[PDB]
């Protein structure tokens, strides 16, 4: 029998860690990359294809799921795992970020009321409502509901949102604990806030550790600050969180962002980049991203990446993917997307192996030299 949630660290190198999260629906290898999940339709990669890229867990966007088809409908269909055809762990976000970035009728300490950008209907989110919707979705890792502060934020607005987020973190904790079916079978992560300000980040860390969570996310980054500033904030923010629990950097990111974040102690990542790039004709490679529409690929018989061992690179040449993309054939975008997600998983595997072997610092330096030289 596997446990509800058990994080184990197998090896360390400086701030970097590798290990596993054991949950009832499966084992997650860390550092982990979560692809953003979709309904199982003909428009998206099949779930068996996503699993075969190496993904151990996928992410569901609560905001989009509550607009279409709705959380009650997903519960009636058997839950998010049945809906997505994915029987391994699923992490759901709280919905709060998309409320700021996509939807907004009322805002107060109680919660938020907002209008669907689809059909204008009114919806409500709060710590209690978010946790309940994530219960209806049946997700394995639940994110606490917080308040996002746009970039850039004044020190006053950053302090105010961080303090509200910590009161909302306690409310998410109590809501999660109130449902025995959820509390016995899922896990709950809290989210550190405080923008670029060290004292606010420390205030937030202390409040979260006092409440107590299964994992801790670093929020408020990857919203336009640039990598240098993001790394500077990670430098002091990650050591503030409890060492024996997973650290999750939400919405990051490009491959070099991930490598540097793992160097700073992050264990978990999610990003739409591999899928967005795949649909726009961009492939990630060890030599940097390439635009497959470029004429120089029209006669290039090599795979997208010379070392990738994804199913696409064992079979398909740059020239043929170039031909499919230039013709507008959906197969072209599917192959690009599969390779990009698999490339991210291969990046995580090399990170994990190099930490295990105590050579991650060298891997990161070798990785950057080659990725930025762009000898593709």
Residue 310 interacts with Zn ion (CB under 5 A): yes or no: yes
Q: Rounded to the nearest whole angstrom, what is the least distance from the CB of residue 340 to Zn ion in the complex? A: 8
Residue 320 C-beta: closest distance to its own copies, Å: 4
CB atoms within 10 A of CB 292: 25
CB under 5 to 8 A by kind: which of its own copies, Zn ion, none does 331 bind? Answer: its own copies
Nearest to 239 by CA among 216, 257, 210, 259: 216
Give SS3 for 63: helix
Minimum gap (Å) between residue 349 Cβ and its own copies: 26
Which of 308, 324, 334, 336 is in the footprint of Zn ion by CB under 5 A? Answer: 308
Nearer to Zn ion, 175 or 312 (CB): 312
Alpha helix locations (H) across 103-226? 127-137, 155-177, 180-183, 198-211
Binding mask 288-307 for its own copies (x = CB under 8 A): -----------x-x------
CB of 49: closest distance to Zn ion in angstroms?
A: 13
Q: Nearest distance from residue 167's CB to its own copies, in Å?
A: 55
232, two tokens: 């500077």
Residues making up the binding site for Zn(2+): 308, 310, 313, 339
Burial class (CB in 10 A: 0-12, 13-18, 19+), 49: middle
Q: 149-188: which residues touch its own copies (CB under 8 A)?
A: none
**Contact assessment for residue 191 and residue 217, using Cβ atoms and an 8 Å cutoff:** yes
Token pair recorded at residue 283: 């492939």
| Residue closer to Zn ion (CB basis): 142 or 308 | 308
CB contact set of 210 (below 8 Å; sequence gap of 6+): none
Rounded CA separation 329/334 (Å): 9
Write down the H helix ranges in the chain.
Answer: 47-52, 62-67, 71-76, 80-84, 96-102, 127-137, 155-177, 180-183, 198-211, 227-237, 255-262, 273-279, 311-315, 318-326, 330-356, 360-373
Contacts of 64 (CB under 8 A, 6+ apart): 98
Nearer to its own copies, 65 or 312 (CB): 312
Does 315 participate in binding its own copies (rule CB under 8 A)?
yes
Toward its own copies, which CB reaches closer, 213 or 316?
316
Nearer to Zn ion, 178 or 306 (CB): 306
φ, ψ dihedrals at 204, nearest 5°? -65, -45
Q: Using CB distances below 5 to 8 A depending on partner kind, what does residue 222 bind out of its own copies, Zn ion, none?
A: none
Q: Which of its own copies, Zn ion, none does 308 bind, CB closer than 5 to 8 A by kind? A: Zn ion
Nearer to Zn ion, 128 or 305 (CB): 305
| Cβ 140 vs Cβ 81: under 8 Å | no
Q: Which of 86, 316, 360, 367 binds its own copies (CB under 8 A)?
A: 316
Contact 354, 259 (CB under 8 A): no
**Out of its own copies, Zn ion, none, which partner does residue 301 contact, by CB within 5 to 8 A per kind?**
its own copies
Virtual CA dihedral for 293, 294, 295, 298, nearest 10 degrees? Answer: -50
Q: Judged by CB under 8 A, does residue 323 bind its own copies?
A: yes
Helices H / strands E in the chain, number of each: 16, 16
Report the nearest approach of Zn ion to the CB of residue 58 (Å): 19
331 binds its own copies (CB under 8 A): yes
**Residues known to be catalytic:** 93, 270
Look up residue 64 and give its two tokens.
């989009």
User: Of Zn ion, its own copies, none, which one sits near residue 339, judging by CB under 5 to 8 A according to partner kind?
Assistant: Zn ion
Show the binding pattern over residues 346-365: x = contacts its own copies (CB under 8 A), - = does not.
--------------------
- Looking at 219-227, 314-322, 337-345, 361-369, which segment touches its own copies (CB under 8 A)? 314-322
Closer residue to its own copies, CB minimum distance, 52 or 319: 319
| Interface ranges with Zn ion (CB under 5 A) | 308, 310, 312-313, 339
Residues near its own copies (CB under 8 A) are 299, 301, 315-317, 319-320, 323-324, 327, 329, 331
């Amino acid at each position: 029998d596997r446990p509800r949630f058990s994080f184990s660290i197998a090896a360390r190198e400086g701030k970097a860690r590798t290990g596993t999260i054991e949950m009832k629906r499966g084992v997650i290898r860390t550092p982990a990359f979560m692809p953003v999940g979709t309904a199982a339709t003909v428009k998206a990669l099949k779930p068996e294809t996503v699993r075969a890229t190496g993904a151990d867990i996928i992410l569901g966007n609560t905001y989009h799921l509550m607009l279409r088809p709705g959380a009650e409908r997903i519960a009636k269909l058997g839950g998010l795992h049945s809906f997505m055809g994915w029987d391994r762990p699923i992490l759901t976000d709280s919905g709060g970020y998309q409320v700021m970035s996509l939807s907004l009728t009322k805002q107060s300490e109680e919660g938020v009321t907002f209008k669907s950008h689809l059909d204008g209907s009114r919806h409500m989110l709060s710590p209690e409502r978010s946790i309940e919707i994530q219960h209806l979705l049946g997700s394995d890792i639940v994110m606490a509901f917080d308040e996002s502060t746009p970039y850039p934020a004044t020190p006053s607005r950053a302090a105010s949102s961080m303090e509200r987020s910590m009161r909302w973190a306690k409310r998410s904790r109590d809501a999660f604990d109130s449902r025995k079916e959820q509390a016995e079978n899922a896990a709950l992560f809290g989210i550190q806030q405080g923008s670029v300000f060290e004292n606010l980040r420390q205030q937030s860390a202390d409040a979260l550790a006092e409440i107590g969570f299964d994992g801790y996310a670093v929020g408020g980054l990857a919203v336009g600050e640039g990598q240098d500033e993001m790394f500077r904030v990670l430098d002091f923010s990650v050591p503030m969180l409890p060492d024996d629990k997973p650290h999750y950097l939400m919405g990051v990111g490009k491959p070099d962002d991930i490598v540097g974040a793992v160097e700073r102690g992050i264990d978990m990542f999610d990003s739409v980049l591999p899928t967005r790039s795949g649909r726009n004709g961009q492939a990630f490679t060890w030599d940097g991203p390439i635009n497959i529409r470029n004429a120089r690929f029209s006669e290039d018989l090599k795979p997208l990446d010379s070392e990738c061992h994804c199913a696409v690179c064992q079979k398909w040449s740059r020239a043929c993917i170039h031909a499919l993309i230039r013709a507008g054939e959906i197969l072209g975008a599917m192959l690009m997307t599969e390779h990009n997600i698999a490339f991210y998983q291969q990046l995580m595997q090399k990170i994990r192996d190099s930490i295990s072997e105590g050579r991650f610092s060298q891997f990161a330096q070798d990785f950057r030299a080659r990725y930025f030289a762009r000898n593709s």
